[PDB]
């Protein structure tokens, strides 16, 4: 059920993408920092707790749902002078109490397998 379309929206956490590039790459929407976090957090919380780490993972590295067309969902790619590896590290902390502080499948605010 933790698959884009199903329990996770297609192209998930659009606002988290921008919140992450704001910080690591220095590019994003013209919205105050607190406003950028909120909107990402809000999006991550609309996802069922059990699928939160997976959503994060799809956003960091992408997912290819099967089907005739089935395009690549999510994934952080390189931006001029901002390698994908840099954005990944920060994206993995979103659930943390430092960041959105949201419980996952373990019932605790952390995604132990996400990063790498």
């Amino acid at each position: 059920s933790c698959v884009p379309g199903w329990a996770i929206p297609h192209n998930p956490l659009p606002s988290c993408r921008w919140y992450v590039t704001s910080r690591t790459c220095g590019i994003g929407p013209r919205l105050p920092w607190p406003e950028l976090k909120r909107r990402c957090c809000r999006e991550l919380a609309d996802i069922p707790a059990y699928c939160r780490c997976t959503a994060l993972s799809i956003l960091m590295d992408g997912a290819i749902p099967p089907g005739p067309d089935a395009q690549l969902e999510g994934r952080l790619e390189d931006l001029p002078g901002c390698p994908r590896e840099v954005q990944r590290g920060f994206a993995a902390t979103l659930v943390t109490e430092a960041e959105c502080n949201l419980a996952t499948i373990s019932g605790v605010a952390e995604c132990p397998w996400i990063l790498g």
Side-chain angles (χ1 to χ4, degrees):
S1 118
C2 292
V3 307
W6 209 140
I8 292 173
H10 258 110
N11 284 316
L13 318 176
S15 285
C16 290
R17 182 172 288 285
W18 292 139
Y19 171 35
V20 165
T21 57
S22 284
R23 182 153 184 325
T24 68
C25 310
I27 71 100
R30 297 195 89 97
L31 243 16
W33 287 100
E35 186 44 45
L36 257 153
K37 180 192 243 165
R38 204 173 71 91
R39 298 186 27 88
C40 159
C41 288
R42 206 274 246 129
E43 273 164 15
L44 198 45
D46 277 329
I47 283 168
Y50 49 98
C51 296
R52 277 161 195 169
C53 294
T54 299
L56 269 204
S57 180
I58 285 175
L59 173 80
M60 289 162 61
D61 316 324
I64 270 300
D69 313 305
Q71 80 134 133
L72 180 278
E73 221 89 43
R75 185 161 176 114
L76 310 157
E77 286 306 33
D78 287 89
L79 282 190
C82 185
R84 126 167 181 89
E85 23 275 318
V86 196
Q87 323 167 40
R88 263 190 115 261
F90 174 63
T93 89
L94 265 9
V95 302
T96 307
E97 45 156 345
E99 299 293 334
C100 293
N101 199 194
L102 286 156
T104 65
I105 186 157
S106 78
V108 171
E110 95 201 352
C111 291
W113 65 274
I114 273 323
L115 200 112

